[PDB]
Amino acid sequence: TQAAQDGQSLKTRTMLQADINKLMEELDNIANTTSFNGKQLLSGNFTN
Amino acid sequence: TQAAQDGQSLKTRTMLQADINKLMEELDNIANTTSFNGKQLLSGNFTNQEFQIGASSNQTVKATIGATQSSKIGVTRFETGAQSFTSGVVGLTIKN
Numbered sequence: 001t002q003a004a005q006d007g008q009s010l011k012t013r014t015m016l017q018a019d020i021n022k023l024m025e026e027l028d029n030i031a032n033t034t035s036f037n038g039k040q041l042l043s044g045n046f047t048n
Numbered sequence: 049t050q051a052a053q054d055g056q057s058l059k060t061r062t063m064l065q066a067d068i069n070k071l072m073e074e075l076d077n078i079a080n081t082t083s084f085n086g087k088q089l090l091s092g093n094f095t096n097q098e099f100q101i102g103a104s105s106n107q108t109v110k111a112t113i114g115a116t117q118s119s120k121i122g123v124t125r126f127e128t129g130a131q132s133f134t135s136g137v138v139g140l141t142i143k144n
Contacts, residue, residue: 004100004108009085 076118090116 002008003016034042050056051064082089092115098108 001100004098006097006099006111007084007087009087012085 072118079115079117089113092117092120 003013008016031042032040034040039046051061079090080088082091087094090113094111094113097111099111100106100108102108
């Protein structure tokens with residue numbers, strides 16, 4: 001939303017995108033990291 | 049208006065025109081200078097810009113500041129007919 005305005009040049013939008021990249025990296029890290037004793041919980045292999 | 053009087057020779061009128069050139073040099077200097085962070089505002093490249101102001105995805109206002117250089121603002125239209133040698137009752141009609 002902050003970058004959806006037109007008071008921001010391509011450089012500042014690029015800063016936004018670079019930050020979003022790291023945030024999404026963190027999201028993937030949480031997903032692939034949370035585990036009980038090896039059993040990865042939030043990855044998709046905890047079914048049935 | 050100061051130059052439309054006939055109490056001024058061509059020399060003094062030239063000082064008038066010499067001045068307008070500088071003033072008009074200033075006008076389009078303002079047009080090419082006002083900017084936020086490089087975005088020229090009063091130049092003609094601020095057309096169809098959005099400003100997301102809503103919770104959902106496409107609520108936005110739009111801004112289309114026209115161009116205001118010294119070559120695009122004052123555009124009058126002159127007309128003049130041939131030397132009329134004939135008489136007669138005339139009625140014009142400026143269409144549209």
